[PDB]
Amino acid sequence: IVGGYTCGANTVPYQVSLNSGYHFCGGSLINSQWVVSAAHCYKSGIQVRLGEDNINVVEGNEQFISASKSIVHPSYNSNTLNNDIMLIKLKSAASLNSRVASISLPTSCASAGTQCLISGWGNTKSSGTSYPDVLKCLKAPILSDSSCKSAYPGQITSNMFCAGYLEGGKDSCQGDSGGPVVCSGKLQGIVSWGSGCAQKNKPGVYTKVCNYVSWIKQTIASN
Numbered sequence: 001i002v003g004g005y006t007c008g009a010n011t012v013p014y015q016v017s018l019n020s021g022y023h024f025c026g027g028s029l030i031n032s033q034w035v036v037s038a039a040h041c042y043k044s045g046i047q048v049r050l051g052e053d054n055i056n057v058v059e060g061n062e063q064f065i066s067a068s069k070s071i072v073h074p075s076y077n078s079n080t081l082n083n084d085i086m087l088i089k090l091k092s093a094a095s096l097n098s099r100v101a102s103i104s105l106p107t108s109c110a111s112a113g114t115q116c117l118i119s120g121w122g123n124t125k126s127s128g129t130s131y132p133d134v135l136k137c138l139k140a141p142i143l144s145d146s147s148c149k150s151a152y153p154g155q156i157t158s159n160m161f162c163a164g165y166l167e168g169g170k171d172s173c174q175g176d177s178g179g180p181v182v183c184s185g186k187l188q189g190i191v192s193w194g195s196g197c198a199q200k201n202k203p204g205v206y207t208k209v210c211n212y213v214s215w216i217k218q219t220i221a222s223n
């Protein structure tokens with residue numbers, strides 16, 4: 001997260017870190033045994049880490065649970081990043097509490113102008129590289145489809161939205177991939193892609209979660 005703030009320990013209780021020897025992606029806990037992330041975060045040997053703040057220190061509220069299976073969206077295209085969504089099932093159910101909690105799926109799509117919270121352990125520099133070890137947060141508005149399409153001609157599908165600031169300086173970045181965009185207590189987006197981070201006229205692009213609720217519910221119900 002570039003241009004954000006330190007969230008505060010366990011203030012984003014649905015935020016998970018995906019770990020394969022090291023943090024490589026974010027995710028969102030949507031019930032006691034399922035996590036939503038980006039399809040481009042797919043790999044084998046995933047351990048889900050819940051209750052994290054400093055991802056380099058065991059602080060006492062963590063639960064570490066290996067994934068039993070991952071399900072990438074059947075229509076995911078890794079070239080265009082259309083349908084950039086994946087479900088991860090935990091080998092055992094997380095113990096839910098005030099610091100480890102699921103986030104509700106949307107019942108309706110959020111509109112341009114809606115204020116959202118984007119979070120993660122990604123790069124905090126738009127040119128350099130610096131990884132925070134504590135969770136970072138950014139408040140950002142959803143942008144209009146027209147401005148999103150104008151920023152990225154030929155690349156924005158009906159399964160994507162832009163959020164952030166056309167002026168630059170505030171954005172999600174490398175390592176935030178797969179993480180939450182939460183608006184009014186609902187998971188509306190997944191950190192997906194962009195052209196660099198926090199660059200002028202290149203806002204972050206996010207998977208439009210409201211388009212996938214039926215798929216998520218049906219997949220969970222049979223897996």
Ligand SMILES: NC1CCCCCC1
Pocket residue numbers: 171172173174175176177191192193194195196197203204205
């Ligand atoms: N806003 C994006 C975050 C996902 C990874 C690519 C960098 C920029």
Ligand SMILES: [Ca+2]
Pocket residue numbers: 052053054055056057058059062
């Ligand atoms: Ca920790």
